[PDB]
């Protein structure tokens, strides 16, 4: 059975939009602020993946053993309806 995982990060912005955010810079425990633009209000950016399993346990594992293989952590929300986990 296949479940979902939404990995999100925080953003702040203001055609041209200017934004900044904190990012991992070599090491899980270390972050750094950065600027970025395109061509003042809070925001959130999300990438989604789906590892296939059988229950909402193994999923919870693989999804924790993925935030492991990356500098990901934070709060975890779960909607059973869409089987969606949400790290932030």
């Amino acid at each position, epitope marked *: 059975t296949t479940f979902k995982l939404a990995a999100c990060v925080t953003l702040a912005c203001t055609r041209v939009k200017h934004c900044s955010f*904190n990012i991992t*810079t070599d090491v*899980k*425990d*270390r*972050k*750094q*602020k*950065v*600027n970025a633009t395109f061509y003042l209000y809070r925001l959130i950016s999300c990438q989604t993946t789906t590892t296939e399993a059988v229950d909402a346990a193994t999923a919870a594992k693989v999804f924790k053993q993925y935030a492991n293989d990356n500098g990901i*952590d934070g709060e975890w929300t779960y909607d059973d309806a869409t089987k969606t986990f949400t790290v932030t």
Partner: antibody, heavy 137, light 111 residues
């Protein structure tokens, strides 16, 4: 062995100019912002100027603005203070002090500023001996 | 550009508790939790005793403590030792990212 050593102090005439310097050692100079603080004979400490680690942002007190310029040369661990249009009143001991700083902790993750730069902790954790500047006619 | 206001002079016996106040404005002391206190011993350079209102750097005795209320901050030394003698200066971050110091307080440990 964090150490700061000021020099260049001496006698100047009002209206004139003079450059002070502060030699740093015992720590990574270019990671820390730096202050100048003066103390007139028998008076209290008075903040003069602050310059960011990379030397791109400068701040000068309102009472000395126009008579001071702060700068630094990270390639030789030195902080400078350029005087001009000096007043008799500017006579004082000038101190070189380091701005405490580093990452900001939220959980177990260290957050650094633009270009992995330290945030300021808003206190001075290293001071020099100070050098005397005498403005006299 | 006018310094923070402190009492010119205070004193107490060894082992006595004393407090020094630091009067400011909403643009400095009452605008941030960034009040630091420095001690200046005769001959020596200044030295941080308390930062961020009530925090102590590594090495400083628990005797020293600070608090803040509105536009005034305070440093308390509960149990004066002889080495506490000297001049004390409060300091605050400003809303313009400057620093401003208080006029200074002479602390005498009655001997």
């Amino acid at each position: 062995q964090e150490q700061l050593v000021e020099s260049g102090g001496g006698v100047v005439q009002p209206g004139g100019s003079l450059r002070l310097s502060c030699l740093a050692s015992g720590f990574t100079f270019h990671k820390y912002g730096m202050h100048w603080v003066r103390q007139a004979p028998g008076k209290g400490l008075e903040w003069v100027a602050l310059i960011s680690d990379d030397g791109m942002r400068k701040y000068h007190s309102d009472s000395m603005w126009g008579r001071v310029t702060i700068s630094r040369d990270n390639s030789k661990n030195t902080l400078y203070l350029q005087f001009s249009s000096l007043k008799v009143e500017d006579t004082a001991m000038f101190f070189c002090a380091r701005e405490a700083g580093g990452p900001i902790w939220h959980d177990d993750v260290k957050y650094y500023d633009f270009n992995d730069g330290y945030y300021n902790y808003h206190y001075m954790d290293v001071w020099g001996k100070g050098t005397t500047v005498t403005v006299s006619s | 550009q006018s310094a923070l206001t402190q009492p010119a002079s205070v004193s107490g016996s060894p082992g006595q508790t004393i407090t020094i106040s630091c009067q400011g404005t909403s643009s400095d002391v009452g605008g941030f939790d960034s009040v630091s206190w420095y001690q200046q011993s005769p001959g020596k350079a200044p030295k941080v005793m308390v930062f961020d209102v009530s925090h102590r750097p590594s090495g400083i005795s628990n005797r020293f403590s600070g608090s803040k209320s509105g536009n005034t901050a305070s440093l308390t030394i509960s149990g004066l030792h002889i080495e506490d003698e000297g001049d004390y200066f409060c300091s605050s971050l400003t809303d313009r990212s400057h620093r401003i110091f208080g006029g200074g307080t002479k602390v005498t440990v009655l001997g």
